[PDB]
């Protein structure tokens, strides 16, 4: 069963060097040939690169030879290297192989990289405190995205909207998260978001209750 | 490069109705591919070589095409199809995707539940106010909030999010944050959103009072 999966930095800076692996299995990295594409975040795809079973490369030429693609056989790892940054190379990164033919059919869950001056920031929490109610948490000023939000630890996925993040004018990303429940409920179920922001390392579980 | 042309770029279709999407090349091809991507996932390889189904997609799909022009057809719109559609080729290099065509469910007018939140304690103690207005579960997207503040129009400081289409109801959900310093904040009384949208007979307004 081919598997892919990226790893990466989700933070660098201007001009600095970006570094991204991918772990594979079930294939031989001699015999095949892995790729990789990029995402800008509300953006189309752009293939970047490939490297044969061999170990010859061939690059988008865009790319201008910033661009290095590596592999090790005995590691399963594929490593993409990408030298002076501009904040127009962050985006979702992802590997990916072809089945049949030359269409790409496995492809990894992708990592965000953000190219960018700016440090980390977790977020601060706040609640949204509510026959049917609205109740949420707002999470606000955090940096870089993305952040996880999740009702109950995920016993709670009917109702769930969460907002996409909004860039503030401070340069600070912001979310909100909303379920609807009963009215009825609200006096007996207990209501608890958790958020989770991988880049700062922080785990937040917000209790929301009537006020 | 190659360069892939998707038209339409949006589109709308109601349940049951046929849809096409086109791709066009610059230059002749030996075969077209096409992705399914939604909500910002991983793509899915969706149809290969021109118009074979990869596995598990459903028979209404299809493609075809030869040269410059391919097509992606659906025979019956159903609401697991809303996503965006990206065509690739693997012909020539640089290999190249298309801008994407994204495809909405056009169906009947829903008019939102409108919910408002007050800041919470723990936010005004550090220093600002944000005020939170709510519309759960509508259609069409094309909604208008306005803010008053003491029965005053805001204009430029708020922000505003949509979701996606929900994949089983079809319908949009949207937040709009009202920012401002707790400072500025307690020097006005009335806080309300205004919400028009044409499954509403006139508009709605949800309010509070500070205290």
């Known amino acids: 069963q081919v598997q892919l999966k990226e790893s990466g930095p989700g933070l660098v800076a201007p001009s600095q060097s970006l570094s991204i692996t991918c772990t594979v299995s079930?294939?031989?990295?001699?015999?095949?040939?892995v790729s990789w594409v990029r995402q800008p975040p509300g953006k189309g795809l752009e293939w970047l690169g490939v490297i044969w079973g061999d170990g010859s490369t061939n690059y988008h030429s865009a790319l201008m030879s910033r661009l290095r693609i590596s592999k090790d056989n005995s590691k399963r790892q594929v490593f993409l290297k990408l030298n002076s940054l501009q904040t127009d190379d962050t985006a979702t990164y992802y590997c990916?192989?072809?089945?049949?033919?030359?269409?790409?059919?496995?492809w990894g869950q992708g990592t965000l990289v953000t190219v960018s001056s700016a440090s980390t920031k977790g977020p601060s929490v706040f609640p949204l405190a509510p026959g049917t109610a609205a109740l949420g948490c707002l999470v606000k000023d955090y940096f870089p995205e993305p952040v996880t939000v999740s009702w109950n630890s995920g016993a709670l996925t009917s109702g769930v909207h969460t907002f996409p993040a909004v860039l503030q004018s401070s340069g600070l990303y912001s979310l909100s998260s909303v379920v609807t429940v009963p009215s009825s409920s609200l006096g007996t179920q207990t209501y608890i978001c958790n958020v989770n922001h991988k880049p700062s390392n922080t785990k937040v579980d917000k209790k929301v209750e009537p006020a | 490069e190659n360069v892939l042309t998707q038209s339409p770029a949006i589109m709308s279709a109601s349940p049951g109705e046929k849809v096409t999407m086109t791709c066009s090349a610059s230059?002749?091809?030996?075969?077209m591919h096409w992705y399914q991507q939604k909500s910002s996932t991983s793509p899915k390889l969706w149809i290969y070589?021109?118009?074979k189904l990869a596995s598990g997609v459903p028979g209404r799909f299809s493609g075809s095409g030869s040269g410059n022009s391919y097509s992606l057809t659906i025979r019956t719109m159903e609401a697991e199809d809303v996503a965006t559609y990206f065509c690739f080729q693997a012909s020539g290099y640089p290999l190249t995707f298309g801008g994407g065509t994204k495809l909405e469910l056009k169906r009947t007018v829903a008019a939102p539940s409108v919910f408002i939140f007050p800041p919470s304690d723990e936010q005004l103690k550090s220093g600002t106010a944000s005020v939170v207005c709510l519309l759960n579960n509508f259609y069409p997207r094309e909604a208008k909030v306005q803010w008053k503040v003491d029965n005053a129009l805001q204009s430029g400081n708020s922000q505003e999010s949509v979701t996606e289409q929900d994949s089983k109801d079809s319908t949009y959900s949207l937040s709009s944050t009202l920012t401002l310093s707790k400072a500025d904040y307690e020097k006005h009384k009335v806080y309300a959103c205004e919400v028009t949208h044409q499954g509403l007979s006139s508009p709605v307004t949800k309010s509070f009072n500070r205290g």
């Open positions: 070589d021109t118009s």
């Open positions: 230059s002749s091809v030996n075969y």
């Open positions: 990916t192989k072809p089945g049949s033919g030359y269409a790409f059919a496995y």
């Open positions: 079930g294939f031989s990295l001699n015999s095949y040939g």
